[PDB]
Design a protein that fits this description.
Layout: H1 21-30, E1 41-48, H2 49-52, E2 65-75, H3 97-108, H4 115-130, E3 131-134, H5 138-153, H6 168-178, E4 198-201, E5 209-212, H7 236-256, H8 265-274, E6 280-285, E7 288-291, E8 301-304, H9 307-321, H10 346-355, E9 361-365, E10 368-373, E11 376-382, H11 391-404, E12 407-408, E13 411-412, H12 416-430, E14 434-437, E15 440-443, H13 451-471, H14 480-483, H15 485-489, E16 493-499, H16 502-511, E17 531-535, E18 538-543, E19 548-553, H17 555-563, H18 578-594, H19 600-620, H20 624-627, H21 652-659, H22 678-685, H23 696-706, H24 712-725, H25 732-743, H26 754-762
Parallel strand pairs: 6-14
Antiparallel strand pairs: 1-2, 3-7, 4-5, 6-8, 9-10, 10-11, 11-16, 12-13, 14-15, 17-18, 18-19
Helix pairs in contact: 3-4, 3-19, 4-17, 6-11, 6-13, 6-22, 7-9, 7-12, 11-12, 12-23, 12-26, 13-22, 18-19, 23-24, 23-25, 24-25
Length: 765
């Protein structure tokens, strides 16, 4: 017989068999994973801030020196992340057994416990047994990398879209539908260095107004190279200083040009090799609820970009993307789910979209594709989306953001320094670049993971799948015809979920809605039926009080989260007992707020445990109200509630006001809104004839991309000459430009484009 326990024994993780650079390199070489020749880095040295950033000397009110990579001694960078829990320290992230015990306690207090309620105990227990929250292992990270490499080079090797018949403009016209963008506006054009994005207007004595045009960074996240072991918040001056120098040196290189006989070529190679570290990310082990069985085989990675690289790319994308709340709910025929929020009537409107007789139809968010076809709901994920990205995918994304974000009626709102960086440098820094793990510098296959940095690129990849789907008359996702798309584009995907008779099942939610907080305004004794699309993590259920469909956190996601709570991070001097009890209040109430309210045992157990923590803090005189002021920052589900200004209370009233329909935000697009849909654009695009909707800025970027890096100034001149000669069909316009670049002898040779040249220079010390 086998011993069985109510409360699982503390799990001791297996030993990491790759916790050594000798073992790691052996494993990578055995799998044919590329290990780069190590590049060195000048040691960090203190320099007076007023000498490096004199334009920010007015910041005397509320670092006298900056630590800069300028020292005469070179070092090889090292990054050894800590994996928690481990065999040595297994108690890092314990399961919430107090919640489990409370659920069991409550289920026993019920006369003749109903299998229905018992299933909540069974589901939580199974999650505790099979899962573990933590950072995985080096072995897991390495196995994941080989899997990332398999997606890029293995079964279905990556393909650059431009080689398949796509162009920068044809992709841009597809993204006009799937990702509509507005201007940076509510702004300054891309013509200035980061330190000049902080503007003082008025007299600096009696409180002057300060204009902040810099994108917002996570101050607690890793700084990246060249500052391992430091946060972004303690390297702010440094990341601006390095960005300043990089852009100033780049401007100089473009000012000097190619030189006689191309004599300035070595100056470009010298600079790019000097700034190699901008193309090398720290391989951060992602903390997640992993399966225990795959602790050594699967650890997700976060490609921690260097701070200057992140800052410079963000200066292009963030001002546009933060000012583009454009989606399915405010633009007709738009498949985008960008900025979608399920609350305030959001989910009700998507369900009504699904229930509409029209089909086939698609929905898109990053690597996520949602399709309804033949009355069936399909949730499609790109198989490790980031690993499918080529450098040409990203420069096409950069082309899109610049031509419709950074353009004033066709005219470029960016200079050639910024055009060069976006088209010919930035794709090379973060795609098919490398990473640092231990003391080893190894290749990155595709783009490195990180939801923030990868969004536009993944969305583009999904947009191409949707285009290819349209071209073959929108076949059913589970057919061989739909599967052939991955071979066509070199982009791996899979169906994670499908629900047959989707409309019928959504309609039955209205009929079979059970009494609860949003139907009768009472504490539920039975869970109300929920329909499981996993629409960005959300299920649908029907509220009788509001008369619409409410959002319910995916059941499996909800119980995984309940099983293994996340840590706080460090806490220098927190009450250490009050702060802990306060974090439990956040944990349990936020768990109810996202969907726990729908599940009777979970709801009541979270309510009780949070209540016991509240009463303990009330008696001890803890500032709980002040602690819960910005609770969204303290919760794993905070992103869904950001900007609502709501308290952490889960009542009939609070759930009603959270879900009460509020009219969708007006669309913000930097051009006439296209309402025709993606099918119309796909069919018009396959004929080969389409116009230049980018105008002058499109030709400038074409010339920049098609010509040598140091000839970027001449490139713009040739594009300006073509634009003035017109006094449109792309195609003939791009052929004429390509002829002008050939006549000026500035056009790069095939297989030796500016993008490929910068990549080689970054890994050639």
């Amino acid at each position: 017989d086998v011993e069985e326990l109510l409360i699982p024994k503390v799990w001791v993780p297996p030993e990491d068999p790759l916790a050594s650079p000798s073992r790691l390199a052996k494993f990578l070489r055995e799998n044919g994973y590329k290990v780069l020749q190590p590049r060195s880095l000048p040691e960090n040295e203190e320099y007076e801030t007023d000498q490096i950033l004199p334009d920010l000397a007015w910041m005397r009110q509320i670092k006298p020196t900056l630590s800069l990579p300028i020292g005469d001694q070179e070092y090889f960078p090292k990054y050894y992340p800590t994996h928690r829990p481990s065999k040595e320290k297994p108690n890092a992230y314990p399961p919430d057994i107090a919640l489990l015990k409370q659920m069991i306690y409550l289920f026993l207090q019920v006369p003749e416990a109903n299998e229905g309620l018992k299933d909540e105990v069974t589901l939580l227990t199974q999650n505790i047994r099979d899962k573990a929250y933590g950072s995985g292992t080096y072995m897991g990270q390495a196995n994941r990398l080989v899997a990332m490499k398999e997606v890029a080079t293995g079964r279905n090797p990556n393909k650059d879209p431009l080689k398949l018949g796509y162009t920068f403009e044809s992709i841009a016209q597809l993204l006009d539908i799937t990702l509509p963008v507005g201007p940076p506006g509510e702004w300054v054009p891309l013509t200035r260095v980061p330190s000049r994005m902080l503007v003082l207007t008025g007299d600096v004595d009696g409180d002057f107004e300060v204009e902040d045009y810099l994108p917002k960074i996570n101050l607690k996240s890793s700084s990246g190279l060249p500052y391992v072991g430091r946060t972004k918040g303690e390297t702010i001056g440094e990341m601006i200083a390095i960005s300043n120098q990089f852009l100033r040196e780049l401007s100089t290189l473009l000012k000097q040009g190619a030189g006689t006989k191309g004599s300035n070529k070595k100056k470009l190679l010298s600079m790019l090799s000097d700034y190699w570290y901008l193309s090398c990310g720290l391989l951060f082990p992602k903390a997640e609820r992993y399966d225990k069985s795959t602790w050594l085989t699967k650890t997700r990675n976060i490609w921690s970009a260097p701070s200057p690289t992140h800052l410079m790319i963000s200066m292009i994308t963030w001002p546009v993307m933060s000012n583009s709340p454009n989606n399915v709910l405010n633009i007709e025929g738009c498949p985008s789910l960008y900025k979608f929020n399920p609350f305030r009537g959001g989910l009700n409107r998507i369900v009504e979209w699904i229930l509409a007789p029209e089909e086939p139809k698609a929905l898109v968010y990053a690597d996520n594709i949602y399709i309804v076809h033949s009355n069936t709901w399909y949730s499609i994920d790109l198989e490790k989306g980031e690993a499918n990205c080529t450098r040409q995918h990203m420069q096409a994304a950069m082309y899109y953001i610049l031509t419709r974000g950074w353009s004033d009626n066709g005219d470029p709102m960016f200079n050639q320094t910024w055009a060069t960086f976006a088209m010919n440098i930035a794709p090379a820094l973060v795609v098919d670049s490398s990473c640092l793990i231990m003391n080893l510098q190894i290749k990155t296959y595709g783009q490195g993971s990180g939801n923030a940095a990868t969004f536009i690129n993944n969305h583009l990849l999904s947009t191409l799948v949707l285009d290819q789907w349209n071209l073959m008359r929108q076949p059913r996702p589970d057919s061989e015809e739909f599967k052939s798309i991955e071979d066509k584009l070199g982009i791996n995907f899979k169906i994670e979920r499908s629900i047959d008779d989707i409309r019928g099942k959504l309609r039955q939610l209205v009929l079979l809605a059970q009494p609860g907080y949003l139907s009768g305004g009472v504490e539920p004794e039975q869970s109300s039926p929920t329909v499981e699309l996993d629409l960005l993590g959300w299920s649908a259920t029907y509220s009788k009080d509001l008369g619409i469909y409410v959002p319910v956190l995916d059941k499996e996601r909800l119980f995984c989260s309940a099983a293994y709570p996340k840590g706080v991070e460090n806490k220098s001097l927190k009450s250490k007992v009050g702060i802990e009890q306060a974090y439990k209040v956040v944990r349990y109430e936020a768990l109810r707020l996202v969907g726990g309210w729908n599940y009777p045992l979970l709801n009541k157990a979270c309510k009780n445990n949070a209540g016991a923590a509240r009463r303990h803090l009330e008696a001890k005189g803890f500032p709980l109200d002040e602690f819960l002021a910005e609770w969204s920052e303290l919760s794993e589900f905070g992103e869904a509630f950001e900007g609502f200004n709501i308290k952490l209370t889960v009542t009939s009233e609070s759930l009603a006001e959270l879900n009460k329909p509020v009219p969708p935000k007006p669309p913000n697009v930097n051009r006439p809104v296209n309402t025709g849909g993606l099918k119309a654009v796909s069919n018009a695009l396959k004929t080969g004839r389409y116009r230049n909707e980018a105008g002058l800025s499109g030709l400038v970027l074409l010339a920049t991309a098609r010509s040598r890096l140091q000839d970027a100034v001449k490139a713009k001149a040739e594009a300006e000459k073509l634009h003035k000669s017109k006094p449109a069909d792309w195609f003939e316009r791009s052929e004429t430009l390509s002829d002008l670049l050939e006549k000026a002898d500035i056009a790069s040779k095939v297989a030796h484009s500016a993008l490929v040249e910068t990549s080689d220079a970054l890994e050639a010390v």
